[PDB]
Each structure stands twice: as structure tokens, then as C-alpha cells.
Amino acid sequence: MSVLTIGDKRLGAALLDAGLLTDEELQRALERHREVGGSLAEVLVDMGLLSERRIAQTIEDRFGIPLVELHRVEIPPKVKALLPAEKAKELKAIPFALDEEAGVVRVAFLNPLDTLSLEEVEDLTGLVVEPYQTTKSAFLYALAKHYPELGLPV
């Protein structure tokens, strides 16, 4: 037993609000969320209940958040100067652009409603960040390209 994030509350409500599952279903998953400590959206795909795109699609329109083809992009060593892949991994985010002339950065994360991770990413550099959407396959892509030494073990 532990508490949940701001994004977890909002996304949980969004499932019912979007007609994806019943509140009872959410109630049963809420307990499971703390058993894995990841965001409530991670347990959804990890348990096969719903994949990122299904959670993202309601939020995409409900909040007006953009989506990009990150799985079709390469992370330059230029943006790596912001934060290393290890930090990116715990924040469940991946930066793609570094624009120091304007103090702006572009990031894509798996939890669009997780405002806490946005706040953490902005304050950690003192810059503004443009939050975009992405999927698990694209997420694992950048990680494998920055730390192939472990090659994401099973």
C-alpha cells in the first residue's frame, strides 16, 4: 500500500469517462498499480488491459496534446547533453530537441497526464518543455540505442 500520482488519478478517471472500462475494473487495477510502482498506465499495458494508444487517444483530444513519429526519429548526441538515458528512463520520458538559444526543450513521454514528471523535467534544467506522446516500442528504442550493453534483458 502506497499513494498514486496526479496523472494516475486523472488517467484512471479518463478510462471510465472514455467508456473503456467500468469503475469497478479501475478499483481492482488501482491496488495492482502500487504492487509494481510504475504509473497506472504502465500496469494497463503490462497486464494487457489497454495499450498506450488507447489511453493516449482520449487524452490527445481531451487536452489537445500532440503526437509524433518518434519511432521514426534518431536521438542526436546534441540533445543527450540535457539528461542521460538513465534519467530519461526513470522519468518515463525521452528528450528529442535541445534549443538553448530560447531555453526550450522537446520531450515525448508515455504518461501525458503525468504533470509531475513534466514539472520535474522543467525545474531540473530551468527551461520550458514541449510535451508530446509516444508508445512502448519507441520508448525502448532510445534506451537500447543509448545502453546496448544490457540489450534490455528478459
UniProtKB/Swiss-Prot annotation:
It comes from the Bacteria. It is found in: Cytoplasm. Disulfide bonds: none annotated. ATPase component of the type IV pilus (T4P) that plays a role in surface and host cell adhesion, colonization, biofilm maturation, virulence, and twitching, a form of surface-associated motility facilitated by cycles of extension, adhesion, and retraction of T4P fibers. Acts as a molecular motor to provide the energy that is required for biogenesis of the pilus and the extrusion of substrates generated in the cytoplasm. PilB ATPase activity is also essential for T4P extension while antagonist PilT ATPase activity is required for T4P retraction. Homohexamer. Interacts with PilC. Belongs to the GSP E family. The ATP-binding site is essential for assembly of pili. This is Type IV pilus assembly ATPase PilB. It comes from Thermus thermophilus (strain ATCC 27634 / DSM 579 / HB8). The chain holds residues 1 to 154 of 889 of the full protein.
